[model samples]
Target: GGSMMPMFLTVYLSNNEQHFTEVPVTPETICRDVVDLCKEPGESDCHLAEVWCGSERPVADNERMFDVLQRFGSQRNEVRFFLRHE
Candidate 1:
């Protein structure tokens, strides 16, 4: 009964170069998709290196955000997802 639910996410870089939210994250969603989500229009020269869930840990690009969010259930609401660029 906890496989699907609404999620609040904040994705951005250190300088806010890539700031976005309301990502379409789900059980089948992964960090690879998040990389693409952060890409801004006409910003053809950008690529995300990593996705960090705060200071907790770095979410691998191949990792499933659904499985990752389980750890942030304590927030019980919105969770901030910071992006890292190479």
Candidate 2:
């Protein structure tokens, strides 16, 4: 079988302000939800212009969520994301 297992990870969004959120993901989870979590309402586009994973690792808009988690393994629970803006 080529199925993937589901897992949970805590995501911290740090921009002009800070937001704490949780995400249920797997290797199949897209980066889209993470991007959305960094966004706030009222703007057509989010102020969060860029996203990075643990230790300033750049994360692509369409990257697999688990790929970033794999980089941290057990420490994935401690994953930190920096949301950059103009």
Candidate 3:
């Protein structure tokens, strides 16, 4: 079988009430990986923002990124997540 091409996905992170956009990701990547990558340099004391595939439910930390995209089908253009730091 041929290799599957990477899909485009936009993740939104609301950190400390401040919203931030992360780089577009593909199924080959993981949500946890993206969270860390998107984090500000040398920034700590932040918690994972809620991440939803479609609704307000958060995807599991170990959940495969591509699986989520497949489940959502073409409608998986964008995803929303939150980051909390006090």
- In angstroms, the error of model 3 at 67 is 1.6
Residue range 9-33, candidate 2, lDDT tens digits = 4445655345756567666766556
Question: What digit string (tens of lDDT, one per residue) describes model 3 on residues 29-70?
Answer: 566554565556434544443444545554544545666555
TM-score for each of the candidates: 0.56, 0.56, 0.48
Candidate 2's C-alpha runs over 4 A off are 1-5, 14-18, 41-54
Candidate with the greatest lDDT versus the true structure: 1
Q: What lDDT is reached at residue 4 by model 2? A: 41
Q: Model 3, residue 28: what's the lDDT? A: 54
Model 3 pairs whose backbones collide: 27-66, 49-82, 49-83, 50-82
TM-score of 1: 0.56
